[PDB]
Amino acid sequence: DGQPLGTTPVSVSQLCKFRGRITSGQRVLNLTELDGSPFMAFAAPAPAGFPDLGSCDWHIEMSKIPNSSTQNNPIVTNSVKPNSQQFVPHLSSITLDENVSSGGDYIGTIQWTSPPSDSGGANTNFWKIPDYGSSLAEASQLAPAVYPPGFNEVIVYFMASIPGPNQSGSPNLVPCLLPQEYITHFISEQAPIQGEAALLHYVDPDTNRNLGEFKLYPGGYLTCVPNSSSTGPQQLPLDGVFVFASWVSRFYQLKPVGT
Amino acid sequence: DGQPLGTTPVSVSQLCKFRGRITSGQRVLNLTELDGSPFMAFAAPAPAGFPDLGSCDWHIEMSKIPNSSTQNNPIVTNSVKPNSQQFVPHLSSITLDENVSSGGDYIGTIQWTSPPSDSGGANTNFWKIPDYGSSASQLAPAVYPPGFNEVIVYFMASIPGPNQSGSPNLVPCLLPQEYITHFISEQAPIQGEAALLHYVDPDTNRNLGEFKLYPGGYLTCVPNSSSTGPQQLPLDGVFVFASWVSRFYQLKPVGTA
Amino acid sequence: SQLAPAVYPPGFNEVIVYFMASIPGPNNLVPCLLPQEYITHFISEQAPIQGEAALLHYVDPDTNRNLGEFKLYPGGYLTCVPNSSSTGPQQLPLDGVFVFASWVSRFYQLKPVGTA
């Protein structure tokens, strides 16, 4: 029904970007919102659109937002260690690894991610989240964890590639619960909820064959029943559209997906 | 009515991005679609979402789209000069400035822009589009400012990069990408010559300014004076559809003074 | 350039069959899309096209049985769904005769063609 939780931005533009002001010759970044307005701790665990790629070493590419410079390349490359104790976005302060010579309002994204440092040589576990600042005391804390429902149902994640090496040499896929277009649509059109879940159909737009049926829970995640030990929904083609079939109860038994 | 024109992508993700195969040790990038698919030259001037930041030098960053690397930093920095005759996206090939060490499928965006080279010191004019190497043309039709003292209204976003005047590097736009995605999703038919949009402050429900949306897909207004216009309007407002209007609908001028 | 248009096999499978012909030279089998006699027959009979596609049987004049079935499109090419990557229309005999049944659409997905 369309209330973003945690640090979900409305649009893709402010999705993984962060903005802040840093003093010259210092590595502390005082976070602000993407539009430049001051960030409030009690609003959210982090400024809207703050990255949540946990268990990895960020590598940012900041730049001065007003673009005062006239000659040189404005891209400044630094790295952030979310496992470090100084990584406290809830307190509107994160410390970069390297000092930045020029002070000013900096805006940047995550360029690539490496396996986390000072963490026993663990792999880039994109399914975990960085330990934000102390949020139990404040009203705004992390969004509740989405546990997988029973009835042999598994949460379906949408995977996109981020640059950066991983210990296994596998593609670096960042999983997400819902596509950002769906989140924007839900935010814009705040339709109410009439059932414990929404029965989505993954249908090929042209051939109109029902590739598989998915349940959309009000918490904002898609679940499915894999057919067997096979990967299940991963075999599905990407040229498909989810169509809302009906409102269903929680105990609805999905037809197994995949072969 | 939700019909994209030119190299317009549906979602923001495929904006200012390009994917292609380049042989090791070379500098020519053979463009493909963003999803690793062959690109049809006849359908579009360029692969979907290919940048149109013309009259400026692109400084791209690239990485292999399957992460086959376990050790080193995957981003490779290169530059593309659109004014060069070798920059021909229509023929699915653009040549980077520097050589690329290892071959493979590289995805990449525009990291920053600099004033165009080989142009007599011209500034980074973002109001022009690259040549695209077209040879009939399937480009999006050029939008002209209508008469009746109407001027097209553009939306500006900052891309990093220097400019000859030290001013913000704001790129113009015709319609926010969320509007484009909504139009594509909701193929609402056009029932009038133009759509009158009210710019309403959500908290106070006050129409700060009124705008005309043309079926071509661009938003126009009427400035109160040469020194004012939509720039004074607060950014927190939301466009609310009001009615279908004829081309001769005379808007109330926006701005002050 | 008013060139003729390239044909894309639509939907799942539905590959486009080709009529190989041999030309002497270096060692050759050039493909084809429609027989010239079929072109002449189509030109002679100016009848309208119904539905989205025309379903065809590859019937044998001997047994009058449909060994294989094909979907004919107004674009001027033939499509079929093979049993597998290798097994498909190639296994069909060369002595068969093509006929016309009715006009079908993308809803009608042909049963796989070939012996595997």
Add this chain to the structure above:
Amino acid sequence: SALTQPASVSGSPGQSITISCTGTSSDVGGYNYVSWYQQHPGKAPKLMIYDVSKRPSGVSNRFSGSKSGNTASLTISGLQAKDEADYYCSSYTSSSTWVFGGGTKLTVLGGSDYEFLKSWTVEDLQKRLLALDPMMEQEIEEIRQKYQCKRQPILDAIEA
């Protein structure tokens, strides 16, 4: 156009001193990018006030700059011996170029009776020997460079 600077500026050691830089509206008043360059006659210049009223690291706080309207001014407080150099102001131009000034020869009197220079730290006298060395050798290669073409033409004339 070319930036204009005073030919020479004088000041006794100990007190403050102001250096002026005047340009056109576009060159110095149009943009806030004016850089002050101090160059000892021997070696390369180095940053003093690379942006107006802003100071690069590794530079004493004595050198400070300011711009009032269409004129940029260097102000130096506590002037002493080792500031003897030619000072240049460089600013951005409307032509997307960087312009340079003529340069001011900072004339600081010292050691008229030769007692002032020895009154400084003992390093300064050794520094003074290290201070004279750079521009004291430039003339050598200055003759050497022309020497590299006072005689090649005459042997070329011999072959002619």
Add this chain to the structure above:
Amino acid sequence: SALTQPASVSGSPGQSITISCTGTSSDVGGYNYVSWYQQHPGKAPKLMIYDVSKRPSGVSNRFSGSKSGNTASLTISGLQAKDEADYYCSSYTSSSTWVFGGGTKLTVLGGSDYEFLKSWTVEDLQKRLLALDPMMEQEIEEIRQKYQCKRQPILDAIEA
């Protein structure tokens, strides 16, 4: 651990030789990145083969490596003297670590009769003059250091 390698394999000039690197599934079989190396005794090692069969620029096409199941092999064709060096295989282990091979030895037995020395080309001879000094320089590195080893605790003893 370490990749098991043959202690030494030799072949006459002209007949191609093959050196194989062995390891477990986690070392070689699991991952496609195996690097084949070669070290002059005095010079630093450089890269022959990386990514199983991909070859960096600057090394002749004759070198060619391959992976067969759990075993990786390097092929050298038409051997001469300049290939006489130890070959090292390295694979990316499952423990997020790079592990080096034991280190194989290859020696060209040609020239022992002392008649094949002249059979080498003048360029082949010329590099041999400039090759027997650097690896002897590697030896004196050990000669200057076994005695630096036993000199060390008298310098302390003289102090103490």
Add this chain to the structure above:
Amino acid sequence: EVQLVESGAEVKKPGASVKVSCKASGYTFTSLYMHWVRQAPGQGLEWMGMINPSGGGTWNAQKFQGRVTMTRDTSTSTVYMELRSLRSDDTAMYYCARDSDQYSQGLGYWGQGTLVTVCSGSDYEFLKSWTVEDLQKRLLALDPMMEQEIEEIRQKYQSKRQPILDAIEA
């Protein structure tokens, strides 16, 4: 730490193209800008051009337009200045410098400089007549000139003696 190393001094004939280099090491070559600064002997600095290491981006001074061509090679991390139509004014101190920082906009990291000196001539006209003439006894004036440089340093030694003379009795 970053160093800017120039190719070195070289004397060029008038009207002959002069090629200079500036080595860059210890920093990312493409991020910062490279500038070219010329200082006429005892006349002051002047700016001729600046180069985009990340591809093209040649912008020079208006009076140098059509005269200076600049290029770079990312493989060797060097920047090359080329000049045309060498005349008596181009003999000066050629400098390569970069901004102190990506957002600094101040040239503070300069090189050693090259003393590219143009042959002013003024001796071809007098010594072209009579062919060889007496230049045979004039081309051997290489050795005697060395004594003058010994005399110059004596003048240089004259002025680098008083500070110690004031130091000893200080």
Add this chain to the structure above:
Amino acid sequence: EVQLVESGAEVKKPGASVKVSCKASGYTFTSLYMHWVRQAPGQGLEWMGMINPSGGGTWNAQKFQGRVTMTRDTSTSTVYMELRSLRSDDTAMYYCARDSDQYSQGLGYWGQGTLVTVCSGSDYEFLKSWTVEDLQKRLLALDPMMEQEIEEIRQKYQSKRQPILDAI
């Protein structure tokens, strides 16, 4: 042109900690990972870990886990190796080597090599009690002996020159 140079050969008393640097220039420092490779005299190459120039990121072999400590300096573009509790087998040719290319994933560009030396002696605190009087003289007397040992391998060098003289 890109090259790696290091501190040089060092001599260390076992049980202490050795510090090794590796100067990197001619390329973007943070772009390429830096590896550390050691080679004992007469033994194969060993891999003691890797260092990410971009913000720490150390991964070292299990047999050297907890022994090496590697850090980088972004200002000077130098990577530091620190190994504590040197042992008899720890003396080796210490190489710092970056990858040939970002996507090559093969050590192609190596350093000049550094030689950390270990002796560990046999019983030297015993030697301090009574041999310290003539220990320096025994050293100085033995100095020319190895000087002709370099001449001994010079004789080997001249011995192998004769076959190449016939080759010419």
